[model samples]
Target: MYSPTSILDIRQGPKEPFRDYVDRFYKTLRAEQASQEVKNAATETLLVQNANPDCKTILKALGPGATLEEMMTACQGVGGPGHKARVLAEAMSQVTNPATIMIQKGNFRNQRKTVKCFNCGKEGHIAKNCRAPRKKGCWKCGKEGHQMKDCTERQAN
Candidate 1:
């Protein structure tokens, strides 16, 4: 049911498939008429989406000019299946004004915490069970023992 091409053949091959060929092909296609910066930005946007499954969070993480509209349109032009763009758009569209406002307010207050483990560079766990032995400390204060604001060493001393 799939069309055949050099890349497709490599995909179906059992031997060491040259993924770089496909990446290069796509990169060439992306570069022929479009800004490579845009392509890299788009890829970074998608990477953020991959990291956070929440489409709203993904949208919020986008920097200047990286609007959802722009991202969706670029995704379509980059040969994404229609269904994929539709799904992403639908999920992103569900980010209501109230939800966005709430998230924005939380972000402004610095109350939103990423659930990633700094020690192991992984998600879903704090530093305790992290395989990496790096010590954890409060973000606002560069020391241990108590919360950032409550640090005795940081009492304007």
Candidate 2:
């Protein structure tokens, strides 16, 4: 016997299409064949309660005595969703799309940081624009003022 609470357990996933939910729920609902155990209370009310906020308001506006089939028709015909809802929906979904590297930094998006620098081997900038003192040395000539190729002391050696 399908427990009456089973009806309440069926939920519409944020990313799941309304039509898909309608069909799946309808099939499950029918499996009980309106048995006393499953149909002890109102079916429409249960559906409205289980629907996500996107479809919840539309279904509630349909009023009493609305069939599951009819309520779903109006829900499927909704023009579009609010951008905020879409954002929540995408985040709650399992797709897990890759976030851009810039976004990984943080919401501020303005601060360019935690990046390696070519000049100082530090973070946040490259050699040309780096504010730190320039690094200069010649390992072969043991000179601190110039690179190996430019060192006069190294020519004689």
Candidate 3:
């Protein structure tokens, strides 16, 4: 017959998850031919004492009267918060990892080379910055379509 004291031999690893320890602890604990009360007390005593330093406080604070089930749940509470932080990637990973370059395919921010400027009649540069001399044309109705001949459109009839 297996001894209840043997349950205490199982030790929690530094990085082993609380759930994994609980499963393994139960696996070994079942081998012992003992009363339910004896097994419960042994399991609790063993699981709490053997818990990793990271989770031991929560396990003990669950109180001596807590059942094995309650102890596991309390122990699990420690993992949820830290699990995400350890598992999730930092923000935009595409920019961080060069080979995964994804977001830049659409277009580079504000550089619009396709746009044609009215000032110098050229692509890429806007009208305001165009350095060429102003083309000869009517003053009001854009410089391109009409010239200063009769100035018919100027009356606005």
Candidate 4:
């Protein structure tokens, strides 16, 4: 009772794990009363379409006549595409976020040692060495031209 169209419509879902997809396909085959040949053929095509590049290579190397069970065994033995992706993602995250490693090493002071000038809000030097023009008014007398300590107006007052 199984038609090729029905099998063709069954694709791997985005969030569905590969093993779950295979199990669902097996259930579909059983429900449709498909023959072993039909199951094998469907399995091969579906696996190829859903598998990652590495898994596709493994499936193709198994030859055309390989059964569904044999393909499953080979894929599982090789740790499957899903497993490989998880391992790769883990490695990538570690490589991208190296600060975590430095934090654990207790060497975080090096990251904080870059000098920042508060006066001009720039890096590589502190406020004392800042060459940027001063603000319009002095901090001590709130007047233009000179700072509070050097203001002649304060002495006159």
Candidate 5:
């Protein structure tokens, strides 16, 4: 039998993936021989308590009647907001670190090196301080002038 205290005590780790956390929760539910209703309730409660703010909104929109399986699918489908942010943060940190070494395999010393802006794909500046005109296109749907990564059309596709 799963104790309510155990469920309450369960908190998702900061670096843990959503799918992994969900799987862990399911394992606990199975070990306790929880009923469908209990499992669903526990899933909802735990997700709300542990998910990121963005994920919480997504979960809230799914409504109370959604089953545990449905919630899991939705959460997985939306992906983990925290994970995305964490990845971006780490990437930015690496790019901005002054001690970062650029390794040129050859002894080609006399060549002039140029910085490329990833944001605009232009020469002479890194994306960190890019002042070039931003490309307004959706990477997912190939649409213009909008956020592409979080686009609804992209998610549908």
Candidate 6:
């Protein structure tokens, strides 16, 4: 169910092994299986009218000379989009490990800022989002909320 951008979001990391990406994609697909409402009988109809870009991208990348319909059939055999995404991600990863295909930051005119905080060691923002709860410990107080350096709790104690 991931877009190519989403796939790239996961891939633009510290060079995870191809198998790891495949495994991760598989896990994602399985985790979201409940959300998939298309049944096998429905898939034929769904495949015809529904334009799932992820499926198209995966099929194109696979280059098996299959039309989108053919690709959809192949993926339907795997069960659903999540499985299909993993399979395609794995296939592409095998051909070219995305981690090594470094898209330089700010180098390309059309390259929107793909580098998130975790990737570039920036502050304020992160990969997931801001205000994401830090583990229940003070980054400064080493307790909850505050870490050791800024811990008012220690003074009270």
| Clash totals for all candidate models | 0, 0, 0, 0, 0, 12
Tens digit per residue, CA lDDT, model 1, 31-139: 5636767757765544333322243343455535666556433332232332466466545755744565665576677533555876556677864345443445443
Off by over 4 Å in 4: 1-19, 34-41, 61-74, 77-86, 89-157
TM-score of each: 0.17, 0.35, 0.35, 0.30, 0.32, 0.23
Residues 75-106 of candidate 5: C-alpha lDDT, one tens digit per residue: 66344444476567546755886432332233
- Model 3, 92-137: lDDT tens digits are 4445676434424544662456458655567767654554546655
Q: Of 1 and 5, which scores higher on TM-score?
A: 5
lDDT of each: 0.44, 0.57, 0.59, 0.57, 0.57, 0.44
Q: Write the per-residue lDDT of candidate 4 for residues 1-157, one digit (tens) a residue.
A: 3457646455544324455556766677778765877767766676668654445665778846668777656655345334567577546756898864765486455454445654555676665445444565353345344654456563555
Model 2: per-residue Cα lDDT over 72-154, one tens digit each = 66566343333465565546542564553334455375444435674467775654355444465553344345554555553
Report the lDDT tens digits of candidate 6 across residue range 1-157: 2346555233312222233444554555566566466544443443333333334344556647766556545434233323466666556765685542443332365444544543235565754454333445444333335543445554554
- lDDT, candidate 3, residue 139? 41
Candidate 6 wrongly placed segments (more than 4 Å): 1-14, 34-157
> How many clashes would you count in candidate 1?
0
lDDT of 5 at 56: 60
Worst 10 residues of 4 by lDDT: 136-145
- Which structure is stronger by TM-score: 2 or 5? 2
Candidate 4 displacement at residue 100 in angstroms: 27
lDDT of 5 at 136: 64
Clashes by residue pair, model 1: none
Against the true structure, what is every candidate's RMSD?
17.8, 22.7, 28.7, 24.9, 16.6, 13.4
Clashing pairs in 3: none
Q: How close to the true structure is residue 149 of candidate 5, measured as C-alpha lDDT? A: 47
Candidate 1 residue runs with Cα over 4 Å from true position: 1-94, 121-157
Q: Best-fitting candidate, measured by lDDT? A: 3
